[PDB]
């Protein structure tokens, strides 16, 4: 009677700000067990030395003081152990956020002809996390650039694209890069932009300068595609899917340069086309969108308890767009490559088992405990039935299923005589006893013996035999016209000790007699101790058919059928 | 805009205690209507005078002062009238509870031989409500007789039956009758009972003296059956069904002399047998239990509004164990004999209609209002579609459904020319227009005119015709082995204004492309403006079959199929 280690908290991927006020980085790991568990940690698939005046432990959590990329960056995972086995936590990656300021060198001036679009390169500084948000400031820091059809800011390159340049756009433009992971924002030095005036602005055809390449995205994620063009007449951008309908969860946005898809499905895979139009010309661009899916469990493993010597199959099934591979760990070490199947299970197999399902994109863990039971045969839970009722000429099966672990051997003895396999007497291996073509000499006391490696068990039962239930008078077929009265006769013989009932069925279907419609034309008039007749009034065409009377008792049932024809 | 009278509160059967403290009896009747209703009352199928001083009116409720059996007891019902018709309330019976005290005459003494059962007659006084409860007192009023297997108290006759008489039974016995309806209790004069002692008492066989006759009871009601026998050895009573199982909601009780059935079903109909046993002999008694069911609505009528000249069918359906008869009243007077059906409805038919469903046991009312509408044809709610899309050689139907009462006449005009019934052009009577084998000359502006007895209406619409979508290159049948790559080709021609899609189906079922299983072997590949091919990888036996490519657009769809054979 114990409790294996179960993971409550597992470490997650973490990024530590380089300039954080706190000098400590903590990874969380916590587990439950009946004997208090022991926690261990591993770094880059290698053991981590304890003490050293750097690492510290806080109830299973690993704390590092003044971490340096040259020392701590990498993969950590946690191990929870006890007297019943070990369990491994999900691998967690620890990295450090990096973001330097822009170079303080002055930016050169840029002159642009009015009516000609231009591109401004942000050239962001060095950074470790690539989840950067880009904006642009005008003249002063508090000022920001509004998103229009002429002005576009790429979220990948970080550049600023102006389709049409006018005198109103003149001024100093600076880039602004923010990282939310490290919460650090920096702006570049301002670039003066001067538009040379023109009296006869020249039109330019639409040219797509911001394109979106082939993108692999996961199911359920939010995906954004960018497409932008330049030209003297403000170009219009339209999105469409190739010979297919656009996904329902699609937002073109007001600007028309960004396409957002929420909770992408497997159907959305294919080509997407962005078309830019103006008065002078037009352009088209096609891109590939591939859809993938993280591994998701179908039948995850649960704490299981099995008997000794019994073959065991654990169903571990996961589904993903790329067929995921299945792995099996035992106490934190590789054990199986998929479809774990055990034979002649013993105490050695018991422990903690972990099924991993991993594709090329993600991996999911499932933890469980396998316990082994060793028990002597006992009939306390499912004892033998005191009285069993049987009839002559009918096969009878007596169940003797005890609670035993190693699947013990079964024997049957008729009180003072031992039974063996015979023609009409059969002992199948599940423990029950079969008797065919029964006679009154068969009734008596039967004892079921179960012999096991650990102990033996004996159970007693009594079987009594009664006369079979048969039908003396069967119903006679009849033919009548519409609107006449019909009578169906049924009389049965049974054992007085047993209770007999009569059930009428029409064309293979039992009549319920609980609906008002059936009572109109059908009535049951059971009389005497064995007479069970049926009356039909105001017969109709649909009433004609097969009527079967069944005498039913607790041991067997006997049926006799007849036909009723209705003419007009 | 009017509103007919609708009943909120209806009078119920009432019993008034003869010696009540309050001297007024009130019957409640309430209805709502847009013109405030007028209330009338009827007594014993006859009008009741409003000015009698005894009677008074309180907001539609009828109050009676100092009611007397000879004058006021009987059947009352309420009538709610207005400018739109009359409605009748459910008939309510008003009766007066009656219970006089016992006669003060002394009761003679009764001597009984020990070992012989006896019967004590209550002789209850006159009473109007028959829901009497019987008990018995010994010597003093607070003392009561407990019900045992020897002592039984009938709830119908009210007598006390003693199966075995002993010396302890001597004493004075008085009957006690209570009525819950009037909450009145009275006890009779005491009867002295003296048992003559006997030595070596001889046993007597069991004789059933309390029997239960054939009983008709309604579905869902509570049924009680009484059976009791007498004899020197205290007899045991058992209840059973002849050739069927006893109802689940059956309680035999501790005494064994009363059988209780709760929420009786239609199945409980049949014979019930009571068996009394002792040492000397036994006895059996059979009785018939018949089950009935009150009328219950299936599709009761509701306030309905219909147009003029339209045939009307009123569905009024009720179900009961005895087939209920259906009657139709109009404004409180007989109108129809069942299944009311009206043709060429006019203003005269509008009013208040009452469907009654009554069997031999109960009756159910259903009140409703039938309104008739006369309206000029209008296209405000369902105007003509501004733009209609069609294809060459394809049949097209243009819907012109106005809101008009007498089903007006319809005409169609191509702007300046009137259309008539033709070979390819047919104008059916519902108002829509059908065109077959359409050509480019057919496209244009069509006007639907609706001429009615009351006014006319004109609606305008524009129908544009486009080229049909067909398949230039059809898929080619292919035969391959398992594990091979197959390509199915499909190319279509369509009108550039319309948007075209491609749908692939396998063996008459469209492929969803939303399940991970389909993506394993199927890859849909679309290119250009008309190329839509499909790729099958790692073919299996189950993949072989019929593949159909369907080019689908807003106007029509064109399909082409092919076959794929798999070997190996
Ligand atoms: C034939 O006999 C049966 C059985 O006696 C009657 O049916 C019972 O009627 C009583 C009331 O007359 C019901 O009791 C009520 O139960 C309500 C809750 O119903 C649920 O819970 C009960 C008990 O577990 C279930 O049986 C039932 O199916 C439901 O699941 C309570 O809310 C009621 O309380 C209110 O009314 C009582 C009335 O005395 C007040 O005292 C309370 O203060 C409160 O206002 C009430 O207790 C009972 O549930 C019904 N069924 C059964 C099986 O007992 C038939 O009415 C009766 N028919 C005829 C024609 O005689
Ligand atoms: C221009 O051309 C159009 C198209 O042919 C005509 O529209 C037809 O109008 C006639 C009436 O003049 C319609 O005939 C009637 O149709 C009724 C509805 O039929 C449907 O429902 C029945 C129900 O059983 C179906 O069996 C049937 O297949 C339909 O689905 C019928 O109920 C009518 O039956 C009888 O009614 C009277 C009653 O006395 C008899 O006198 C009749 O002779 C008839 O036996 C009747 O058949 C016809 O249905 C309309 N066409 C279509 C396609 O529905 C226009 O009338 C014609 N002229 C003008 C000016 O528009
Ligand atoms: C956008 O970038 C442009 C870059 O060209 C920038 O233009 C410069 O602005 C400064 C600030 O106004 C200018 O410097 C001034 O020039 C005027 C005209 O010559 C002088 O009168 C000013 O003198 C005052 O300030 C001096 C500061 O030392 C004092 O010493 C003096 O006593 C006066 O108080 C001042 O020198 C500069 O000429 C322009 N142009 C260039 C090429 O630098 C612009 O300001 C930026 N911001 C915008 C446009 O919002
Ligand atoms: C007395 O008679 C009974 C009644 O037959 C007998 O019980 C039988 O035992 C045999 C031996 O195991 C059972 O046969 C097996 O049953 C299991 C469960 O269904 C099957 O999985 C087995 O299939 C394998 O074995 C076959 C060869 O037996 C192979 O050909 C097959 O390809 C499989 O590899 C096998 O069929 C049999 O089912 C029972 N009978 C039952 C359950 O009704 C008993 O052994 C006899 N002797 C005694 C009691 O001393
Ligand atoms: C993708 O965006 C949707 C936006 O709806 C996210 O769904 C939730 O939307 C509600 C809107 O009120 C937000 O309050 C929630 O915070 C959103 N998230 C969740 C988990 O509920 C969705 O989560 C986004 N998915 C990703 C992967 O970013
Ligand atoms: C078929 O039997 C039924 C049931 O008896 C007959 O219906 C009624 O039966 C009662 C029996 O007491 C008679 O009093 C009625 O006169 C019978 N008729 C009706 C209409 O209720 C039924 O009549 C019998 N069949 C025929 C063809 O008469
Ligand atoms: C059928 O075509 C598919 C698609 O071209 C082939 O898939 C290849 O799969 C392997 C393993 O994932 C990739 O490395 C290859 O790149 C895929 N092919 C191409 C062209 O990229 C598949 O092998 C083909 N099978 C047969 C029997 O021809
Ligand atoms: C394990 O328990 C979960 C609890 O919801 C259940 O969904 C799952 O089916 C169980 N495992 C198996 C193999 O049934
Ligand atoms: C059956 O087992 C019980 C133990 O529970 C034992 O007392 C009894 O003697 C056994 N019967 C035999 C061996 O016949
Ligand atoms: C019954 O009444 C009689 C008549 O007065 C009396 O003699 C006798 O004692 C009474 N019995 C009991 C038990 O009080
Ligand atoms: C009639 O109205 C009642 C409610 O008043 C509703 O329960 C019933 O379903 C309605 N039946 C029809 C046919 O509209
Ligand atoms: C349609 O009817 C309206 C009034 O009902 C009228 O003003 C209009 O001129 C009519 N149009 C045609 C085309 O008859």
Author numbering:
A (entry chain B), B (entry chain A): 37 to 604
Question: Which of the paper's sentences describe this entry?
Answer:
Cell-surface expressed contactin 1 and neurofascin 155 control wiring of the nervous system and interact across cells to form and maintain paranodal myelin-axon junctions. Defining subfamily features are extracellular six N-terminal immunoglobulin-like domains (Ig), four fibronectin type III domains (FnIII) and posttranslational modifications, i.e., N-glycosylation at multiple sites and a C-terminal glycophosphatidylinositol (GPI)-membrane anchor. All four members are type I transmembrane proteins with six extracellular N-terminal Ig like domains, three to five FnIII domains, various predicted N-glycosylation sites, a single transmembrane spanning helix, and a ∼120 cytoplasmic region with a highly conserved ankyrin binding sequence. To address these questions, we structurally characterized the contactin 1 and neurofascin 155 interacting regions, i.e., Ig1–Ig6, individually and in complex.
The Ig5–Ig6 combination orients away but nearly in plane with the Ig1–Ig4 horseshoe in a curved architecture giving the molecule a sickle-like shape, with Ig1–Ig4 forming the “handle” and Ig5–Ig6 the curved “blade”. Contactin 1 Ig1–Ig4 horseshoe segment resembles previously reported contactin 1, 2, 4 and 5 segments. Contactin 1 forms a larger-order zipper in the crystal that is also formed in solution and the neurofascin 155 binding site is exposed in this oligomer. The zipper arrangement emerges from four interfaces, denoted α to δ, that capture four separate dimeric arrangements of constituting chains. The dimer burying most surface area buries 2980 Å2 and does so using twice the interface α where Ig3–Ig4 on one molecule contact Ig6 of the other molecule. The second dimeric arrangement involves interface β burying 1190 Å2 through Ig3–Ig3 interactions between chain A and a symmetry related chain B. In interface γ, Ig3 of chain A contacts Ig5–Ig6 of a symmetry related equivalent molecule, whereas interface δ forms by Ig6–Ig6 interactions between chain B and a symmetry related chain A. Addition of a contactin 1 molecule to a dimer formed through interface α to form a trimer, contributes two additional interaction interfaces, e.g., β and γ. In particular the glycans on Asn258 of Ig3 and Asn521 of Ig6 are located close to intermolecular interaction sites and may influence interactions depending on their composition. Contactin 1 may however form cis interactions, and the zipper is compatible with cis-interactions as the c-termini, that connect to the cell surface, are all on the same side. While contactin 1 and neurofascin 155 interact in a mode similar as to neurofascin30 and contactin 222 homodimerization, in the structure we report contactin 1 does not form homodimers via the Ig1–Ig2 interface.
